[PDB]
């Protein structure tokens with residue numbers, strides 16, 4: 001994935 | 013609801029626009045995300061891996077890298093930096 005897609009999982 | 017960053021974490025967050033002394037965890041993750049992106053600390057090929065050696069973030073988290081997929085461990089690392 002992209003960094004942001006991984007980060008969004010974390011943020012959610 | 014709310015958490016209080018210690019001084020060095022608070023400096024990191026304020027460096028990417030944060031205005032407060034206390035935050036929700038989601039706001040903490042939000043500013044931390046801005047930070048990682050602005051400094052391009054993630055691996056261009058394996059974008060879940062953050063390299064934080066030789067950065068303030070690595071001093072705070074006490075690791076030279078970590079995986080974004082390790083959500084609980086990231087909370088552990090942040091909580092070391094909460095009052």
Ligand SMILES: *CCn1nnc2c1-c1ccccc1-c1nnn(CC*)c1-c1ccccc1-2
Nearest residue numbers: 003004005007008011012038041042045046
């Ligand atoms: C690809 C990264 N992304 N995806 N969704 C959000 C973000 C994001 C982008 C740029 C900086 C920070 C974030 C971010 N970090 N944490 N969150 C919430 C846990 C976000 C975010 C917040 C609100 C909307 C979208 C994102």
